[PDB]
Amino acid sequence: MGPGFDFAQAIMKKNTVIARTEKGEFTMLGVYDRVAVIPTHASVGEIIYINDVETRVLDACALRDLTDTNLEITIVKLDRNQKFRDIRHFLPRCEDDYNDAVLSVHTSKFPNMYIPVGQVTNYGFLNLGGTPTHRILMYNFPTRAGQCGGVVTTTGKVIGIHVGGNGAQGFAAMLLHSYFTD
Numbered sequence: 001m002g003p004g005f006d007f008a009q010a011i012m013k014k015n016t017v018i019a020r021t022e023k024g025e026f027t028m029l030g031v032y033d034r035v036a037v038i039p040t041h042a043s044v045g046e047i048i049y050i051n052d053v054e055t056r057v058l059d060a061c062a063l064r065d066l067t068d069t070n071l072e073i074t075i076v077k078l079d080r081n082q083k084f085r086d087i088r089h090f091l092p093r094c095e096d097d098y099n100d101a102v103l104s105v106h107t108s109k110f111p112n113m114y115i116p117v118g119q120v121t122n123y124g125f126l127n128l129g130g131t132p133t134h135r136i137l138m139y140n141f142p143t144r145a146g147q148c149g150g151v152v153t154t155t156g157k158v159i160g161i162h163v164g165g166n167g168a169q170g171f172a173a174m175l176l177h178s179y180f181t182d
C-alpha cells in the first residue's frame with residue numbers, strides 16, 4: 001500500500017522459502033548463497049523440507065552471544081541447487097530501535113501476509129518460553145502462532161525474524177550484518 005510494504009514485498013518475493021521441520025512450517029529468510037535463517041525453536045536437523053522438497057542441511061548453527069545467552073537465530077546452509085539474492089547490505093550493523101516496521105509471513109496457513117506493526121523497541125532481555133534470550137526487538141501487535149520466522153523490515157533494512165509473542169506484544173530476534181561475514 002506504501003513504501004514500507006514495497007520493500008517488504010521485494011524481500012518476500014526473492015529472499016523467502018517455506019521451511020518445514022518436525023516442529024512445523026516456518027517463513028525462512030535466505031540471506032546470501034545457500035545460507036538462510038530460522039528461529040532456533042524450529043529444531044533444524046540433518047534434513048529439512050524447502051518448498052516441499054527434501055533438502056540436506058550442510059551446516060546449522062544456533063547462535064548465542066558471548067555471555068553464552070540464546071539469540072534464537074539458527075543459521076542454516078542448505079544443499080540447494082540455487083543461490084539467494086545477496087541481501088547482506090540491508091542488514092543493520094548495530095542494535096537499534098526503529099520506526100514504522102512491517103512483519104511479512106509466507107506459509108501454507110498465511111500466504112502473502114503483511115502486518116504494519118509500527119514502532120520497534122530494542123527490548124533486549126526476554127524470558128522466551130522459559131529460555132533467557134538477548135537482542136530482542138518488541139512491537140505492540142498481537143501476533144499469533146504461524147508467524148514465527150516472519151521477516152521484520154523497515155524501508156531499506158531487514159532488521160529481525162519473529163520468534164514469539166505474549167498475546168499483546170510480538171518479539172523478533174535481531175539480524176546483524178556481523179552474523180553473515182564470509
Ligand SMILES: CCC(=O)Nc1ccc(C)cc1O
Pocket residue numbers: 040041072128129130131
Ligand atoms: C517444547 C520444546 C521447547 O523447548 N520449547 C522452547 C521454548 C522456548 C524456546 C526459546 C525454545 C524452545 O524450543
